[PDB]
Amino acid sequence: QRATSNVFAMFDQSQIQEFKEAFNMIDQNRDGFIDKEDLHDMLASMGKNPTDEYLEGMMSEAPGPINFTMFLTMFGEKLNGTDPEDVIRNAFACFDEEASGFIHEDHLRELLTTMGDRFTDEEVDEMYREAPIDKKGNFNYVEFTRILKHGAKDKDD
Amino acid sequence: PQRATSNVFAMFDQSQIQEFKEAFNMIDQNRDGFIDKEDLHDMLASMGKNPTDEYLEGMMSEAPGPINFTMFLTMFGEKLNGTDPEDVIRNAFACFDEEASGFIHEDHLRELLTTMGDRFTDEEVDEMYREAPIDKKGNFNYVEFTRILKHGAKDKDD
């Protein structure tokens, strides 16, 4: 047999159907596995040139556990305890009465970087630099939540 | 009549066979077009808890050997007859009582069901009482009843 199984649990019902569409569109030959020939030549269709062998490296992570069903198991395994952005939006809006993305940069600095969780300033600079900065130098926690959930963009090829 | 269903469930809409082929594809982890002990004992275990009773051999013995896609489709095809989707039942329930509030009183329900038409026993009619959720004070709602009769709603979950 294929010999792959795990304890099943639902994480996002409104996402699995898109996950199954993604699995179908990559799996042109309808194999259920992950193949370098199947994906790399297909990635180069819309992509520029993903010829570097990090793909074979990542398909070499574990010996033959790949299947459509376990594609949910790995993602749920990585990430657990996730809340929708809108309730997270309310949580962000809790401290600031404006609740219009005008969270001040120094407000966020003074609060998060030092008081409460004592950590370095670097672990916030990546949000400072990678993510866009709101007008006047604010924290547009609306589009910030959007990029936390789905709006994060990078090189699309 | 013969009730052999020579054609492959031709007396029905074809949408349900796309849902059935999706179900077949998702149960067929081997994906060879045939069910298997390997197939069900893990796909049923995906939501189940590895049952000890050997009723998947019940399926493979109901239709001997591994069953074809068409075999699965026709063994469901013999399971559908003399029934219609929710629209007609809803319209009839709207017809019989003008108020359409679904206040089918228990005495009224039994009078309208067991007494006239094809004679059958109220004792077997009681299966509609001990299992189906009847509303209180005698009246009996139908919209939830229609939904549970169709695939829209289920009383419980595994």
Partner: protein
């Protein structure tokens, strides 16, 4: 011959059951929608009243 004649048996019985049942219940719906239309008639009647 017997195979094809019972094929017409099944086909025609299923089609006649479906068609006649739909027709009778559709006349039931005919009466029902006529009743709702006449309730709308009395609604306009009480507005005029």
């Amino acid at each position: 011959q017997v195979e094809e004649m019972k094929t017409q048996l099944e086909e025609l019985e299923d089609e006649l059951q479906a068609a006649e049942d739909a027709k009778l219940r559709l006349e039931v719906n005919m009466q029902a929608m006529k009743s709702q239309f006449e309730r709308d008639l009395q609604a306009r009647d009480e507005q005029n009243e």
